[PDB]
Amino acid sequence: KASGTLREYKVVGRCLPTPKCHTPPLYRMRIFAPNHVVAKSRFWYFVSQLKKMKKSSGEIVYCGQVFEKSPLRVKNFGIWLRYDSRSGTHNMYREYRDLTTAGAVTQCYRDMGARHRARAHSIQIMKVEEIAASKCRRPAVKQFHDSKIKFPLPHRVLRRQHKPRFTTKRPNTFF
Amino acid sequence: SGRLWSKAIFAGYKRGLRNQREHTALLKIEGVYARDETEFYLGKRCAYVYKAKNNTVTPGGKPNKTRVIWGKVTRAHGNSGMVRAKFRSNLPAKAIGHRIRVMLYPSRI
């Protein structure tokens, strides 16, 4: 599974009815995927792992994107996941700050790739939850819980290094 | 009276790493360093003006040493403001790093 900016999908599926149970149970999952095709594929992967279901023996009755119910509010996200390292499988709890749940999960995927070299096929997101600022455990997240937060931008690197490419004046980094 | 043409540099031919398509040339127009700035110069006439030993007839003038290979800008090349040019005859390789004039002629402004 590749990535992009991930989206949350509510995927509901069920086994096909048989003359053993005319109404098989419906199962719902949250899948964070680039698009609905990958979302359906990951739904089948996960329900094959959990229940004894297959894409051939079952069907997907709903697959719809879940829009964030408050994208204008900064909030803390705790994510419980598991992943395969080069030498085993580990459970992790990670914390992020973002406006959207899908953005937080994307942050998680990038951060796992950056810190643990974990590719997206190795990572199994098993719980995402908005948490109160008192329930946070990661100091890098907790340090932004200041009602009077204040910091400068110390050493501002010139990013327009080629417009102009040649110039007489040397850049200023203090602003 | 004045220059009346934009300066450009014959940077090289359209090419892969190990193949060279001499029929089309790459021009670096002075002051155009982004792809979105190249839209003005598309379709403009361009000239490679040089001197030789024998005199050749000059339109509206006396024969002199000046010779021209005419051409025009066809499209943009790269993100950094290159352009591609097609000339009436393929540009000689001694002209690489030399002056090309973009003549403003087929004006759209």
């Binding site: 010139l158 040649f166 850049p171 | 690489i96 790093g97």
Partner: protein, 201 residues
Amino acid sequence: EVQVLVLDGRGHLLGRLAAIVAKQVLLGRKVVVVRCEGINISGNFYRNKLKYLAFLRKRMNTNPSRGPYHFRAPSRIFWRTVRGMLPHKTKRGQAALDRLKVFDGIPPPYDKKKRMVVPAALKVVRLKPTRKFAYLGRLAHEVGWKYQAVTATLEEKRKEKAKIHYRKKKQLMRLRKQAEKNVEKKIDKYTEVLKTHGLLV
């Protein structure tokens, strides 16, 4: 362009500036790099000195007089770095190499001219402030260059003369500001045109 592009080597990173210069001279442009002893190299000095000492070790075993020519002046070091980014075994590459001049210090043709700066090669923006770096002049001096002291003395004389010239320029500009204040009733008519069209805030 058509003029000579004069670049000050102080505060610039070696390979970044050399890539810029190589592309410029391949585009048929005259380039002159002055004060090549002020060029910086990222990474600490011992590491960069070790790299140059490995370069010194690489020599032709049968006849070292034919082997790699290890140039010890900072200008020649930068010249060889640019040659490493130029296709110097063809006529186009040799002409591009000819279009480049390199100097230690600033010689009299160029000490009286303004000098450009390449931000994409500057240490201050290309290098994190906590990282270490080496000076090309110091590295050259400790690997075999002989003219670090005399170049420093001549640079200090050049700086004294430049300070005098800058004081004269400041005094002239102060006098110009006073002149603009002196004549303003006969100037405001054109000052308003300039202000209207955005020149002269």
